[PDB]
Every structure is written in C-alpha cells, then in structure tokens.
C-alpha cells in the first residue's frame, strides 16, 4: 500500500511540530504501520520522536507515543484511561547514535496489527519487540485524540517529552505490513551482523566475540552462541564460527567449533521480566570464552574455550578440583558411574576406561568425541528441550536420542563437575573444526582449571610460540607451546589481586617483548610485560586516561602494522566509563622506542558516551582497516538481559581515529 502521511527532514530543536491537519484525517482501520527515520547523537534524557495524543485538560493520559532514551532504549507507550489501558514496551540498547564522528539515520518500523492484536518494533533491521495482547488499542482509537506530534506528546495543551534531533522521513500506513515487507525497507545501518538471531545456530543471543585475521587474509570470528538468555554457564551454549573472505564485508553461515547435544539448538524468547528473566537452563553442559590464533608452522587454526559439565558454571564449579587423577608423573580425567559416591573410574589412553579401586580396564571406553561406548556401542541419553509453556522454565525429555558423553546429565559415566578448558584445530582455516580435547591441568590436583581469557592467542613473529593468556586466582596463567598446539606449559604471572575477573589480552610491541593488557578491579586498566617470549613477566601497572567500573569489562588490543605520527602503535578497544560498560572507544598509543612506553594519544568514540559497549574484538582487516566486532549494550546492567542481535560488526580506517 502506498502511505497515508508522508514528510521529511524535520528538525526537532526541543520544540514540537504539529502535524494534526496534515494526519488526524488520514488514519482510518484499527491497523497502522509507522516507518521514521531518524537522528539523535544528542538526546535528551527521554524524549518522545512521535505522538498522537488528546491533548485536552482532564486526559493527559490518553496517548500514543515513539519514545527513546539517551541510554539507547526505545519503546511505545499506548494509553486510553476510559478503557483502562497503559501498555508499555520497549527495549534497552536499540540504537545508534553516530559512527564516525556523523549522526546515524536509524530506521524504525513500527507495527500495530489489530488482527493479530500485535505490536511490533524494529530498528535498523532488527526485531527489538513483538507483543501481543488480549485486549487490543488501535493507537487511533484512543479517546478523544486531536493531535499528532513530532518531537513531543502534547498533554492537556503543554509539550511532555521534549526532543532533540531530527525525523529525515517519517510514513504512515494503515495497515500492519508483513515482516516480508518489512524486510524490504532500506536501511542506513552503520554496522552489520556476523551471527544473528535465526541463524544455523539457532540461538536467539550471542556474547563473547572474537576476532583474528588469518595469512590467508580470511577473517575469522568466533562467538558464544547462547541458547538460554544471555547469562553465563550454567546454561546450554555452544562456540559458533564464521569467517570473510572479503575484508570483513560479507561473512559465512555460522557453524560450531564446539557443540553439546545433550538439550536441543532451540531458538527461544527469554523473559525479560523481574519474576522470569533469572530464569536459567540448569541441566545441560555448555561451553564458555574461546580464544583464537594461527599456527604460522603448522598453518592450523587452534581455538580453545572453557567447557562446563551439565549444570556447572563459574558460580559452583568445584574450585579444589581439577578433575583430573595423577598417577606416575601423568594426568587422568576421572569419572563417577551411576549410583557410586565416588569418583572411582579414570579415562587412559586409547579412551580405556579404568577401575581406579580394583586397578583393572572395564569394557567401557571413551572416544574422541568424549561420548561413552561399552564394547565398542554406542551408548545414548535422550535428549532435553526447553519450555515456557507451564509459565515458568521447564527442562524436559524431548524423545530423541543422542551419543551419550561424559560432560551430560543423563550419563552412566559423569566427571568432576568442575570447568576446564578445551581446545580444537581447524586445517582449512575455520571451514570445519576437529573435535575437542581437554588440555591437562597446569596448576596441580587440586585446583579447578583456570580461565581462558576470550579473544586472541598470541602468535610471536620471530618464532612458532603460540601463547593464550588464562587467569585465576591470583595470576595469570600464560599457557605456552612451541610445537603447535602438541603440548603445553604454564607461565605463571602474580598479579595484586585475589579472585578477580582478569580477563588479558597480549600485544607484541617488538621481537620477544610482549605487553599484557588486563581488566582488574581498580577502575583502571592494567599491564604487565615480558622481555622473553613469555618465561618471565614484570610487575603490573596502570593506564590513566581510560576510566573502567569497579568491576571492570574485557579489554581487546593489537599492534597496528603501520606507523602513526611515525611511531608504533597499539590499539585498545574498551568501554570508557566509570559508571556501566558504555561509551566505547578505540584508543590509540604510540609506542616510545627508549622504555617501551605508550603515550595514549587518540581516544576514537565508537557511538554515544551513554551508549552501550561491553566485550569487544578488534583485527587489522588485509586491507589495513580495522573491524570491531563488540557487544553494543551493557552487558552488566541487570536491565539489558536478554536482548538479540546487538553483538555487531564495523569496519573502521584509521583516519577515523585520529
């Protein structure tokens, strides 16, 4: 259908526009569509683009309204007091606010389906809410309505919600268009999605990118495809991967690097409210933070990721347990059987399981896919899904049987439910990964395994060191190869901190000099460095002039290949706020060649200081660009649980930032 109303580049200078004469007459049906688009890279603190209001003494709660929040919200308001109505819904972090130093035309589409007694909302592409209701207001039919309103609600004759910005295009329809057609509205998005919300992995929420540019000049990315909300194991998630083969411009469908079967890949709508959005899948086993490098010897990929068995997580994981049995000199995964109170079994080589009580081999064994045979059968569990259907979360058996594996629920042999961490090899750079394996433990019997710090390994250029960074309490713990990937050793690293969350990322500034970027509890960022490929680290400072929450979010960094004001350079991506994971920035730092220093000279606003910014990937694309694959909300704040498709993608040069 054509629109009804159409206009265009209005300016909203904390002074409404009426647009009654032009639209009150227009509107007919109980079904409407409104398309706007739109700019606002200096809201007001909450400001309403779009309103239909009774603007008479006695009903300044009879309207409808388009509303926003400097915080990035977006949402509707739909309200008749005769009827005894007040609907409101919306969603955190559903904007842009600039890229690139420009204000972003953002595009809204709004749709009220009387049939379906529907609201839906997109921006940029992206289905932020669909709500249906048992009693339906058609946002026309409310009571009395005698003004339409850009920049403002009027209510009983005075201007609520004043906003700053502008309405480049706004049409209205009457009727609900299809999302088909929705589909065929162009946008002016300054970002794009890698992994999304219906794709092969079929989880509705993503966290935890990754980034790294592969000799080939491939770009690989890799993700936390998380099934049940976005909250951390305990949980189903998977690790995904995707790759470009076109400097970041177009990407691969997704596939698993990592993969549990034990609940079903479901697509589901978590709860959002304060009674549900806690919610949290209990049962299945996940996987959790992987990390990425290129062996440049072997010419493989190696990912590593924490894996978490059937309803552990980093809240309950056994911390005095590394899961493992020494016996000679060498490290054994342990295993309980059905109905024992011990762990009484170990895995040896060839998959053998073994009688640790009578010293002798069962007929079970375990194979690469660390799945239970018995005499060389398959043995399976029947598989769980998901459900909202009794009003509150339901784990239940959903008839289908899959191979029975040691980190499930359902297992006749379970092991030590306790994290650890796993790697896989890709030898056609992320177009198929092999199956896991678990890295022994580094820090002895009795100490849970440490935890992968998400992002990059590091591979040194002047040999075939292959580093990725993990903590615990207390350190970080540097895990080192020198024969890609084979085997591993530890570097330990004291760091002044117990129990925190440093999550490091390595940079190498020259040949053997490594800087260690790390997330702490002070509000600063950290670093520490190491003059000798790894074997030993210096004692930790502190970067001023970048400000992080007390309890800190992940900090991604490269060394840039080109020289900038004719120095070196290092590039951090990071949150820059003392208040909540937003206000993202690329900061840029010359390296002085007489102490190794960095001047930190550039600081680079990716959006809005009030708009969200959480864990982050940078890469140096072929072509010297920069992309930033980021969580573009606040991945911290209790209120933005549970939201889809705002891990996003941009390509940068580097005169943007400078």
Known sequence: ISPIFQGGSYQLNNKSIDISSLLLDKLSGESQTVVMKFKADKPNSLQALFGLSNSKAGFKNNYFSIFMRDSGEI?????????????????????????????????????????????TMYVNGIEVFSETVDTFLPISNINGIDKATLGAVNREGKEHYLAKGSIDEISLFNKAISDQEVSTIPLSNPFQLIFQSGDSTQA???????????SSGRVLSSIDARYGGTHDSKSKINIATSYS???????????????????????????RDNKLKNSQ????????????????KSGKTILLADVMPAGIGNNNANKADSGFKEINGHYYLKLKK??????????????????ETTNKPTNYTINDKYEVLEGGKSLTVEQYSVDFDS????????????????????????????????????????????????????????HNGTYLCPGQGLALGSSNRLIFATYTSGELTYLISDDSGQTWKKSSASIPFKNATAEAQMVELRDGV??????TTTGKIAYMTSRDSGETWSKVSYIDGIQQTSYGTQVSAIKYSQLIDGKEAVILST??????????????????????????????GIDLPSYGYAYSAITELPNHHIGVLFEKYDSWSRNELHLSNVVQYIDLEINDLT
């Open 75 to 119: 949402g509707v308001e739909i309200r008749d007091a005769q009827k005894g109505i007040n609907y409101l819904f919306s969603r955190p972090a559903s904007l842009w606010g600039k890229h690139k130093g420009q204000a972003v035309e953002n595009t809204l589409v709004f749709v009220s389906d009387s049939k379906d007694k529907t609201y």
């Open 204 to 214: 509705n929420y993503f966290r935890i990118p990754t980034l790294y540019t592969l």
């Open 245 to 271: 083969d076109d400097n970041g411009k177009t990407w691969s469908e997704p596939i698993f690097a990592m993969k549990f079967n034990d609940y079903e890949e479901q697509l589901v709508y978590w709860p």
């Open 281 to 296: 899948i209990s049962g299945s086993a996940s996987f959790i933070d992987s990390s990425i490098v290129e062996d440049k």
């Open 338 to 355: 059905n109905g024992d109170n011990d762990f009484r079994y170990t895995v040896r080589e060839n998959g053998v399981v073994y009688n």
């Open 391 to 446: 009003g509150s979360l339901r784990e239940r058996h959903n008839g289908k049987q899959v191979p029975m594996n040691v980190f499930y629920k359902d297992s006749l042999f379970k092991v030590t439910p306790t994290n650890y961490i796993a790697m896989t090899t890709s030898q056609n750079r992320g177009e198929s990964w092999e199956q896991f394996k678990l890295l022994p433990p580094f820090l002895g019997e009795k």
């Open 514 to 519: 490594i800087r260690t970027f790390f997330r």
């Open 575 to 604: 949150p820059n706020s003392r208040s909540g994971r937003k206000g993202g920035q690329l900061v840029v730092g010359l390296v002085n060649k007489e102490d190794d220093s960095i001047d930190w000279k550039y600081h680079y």
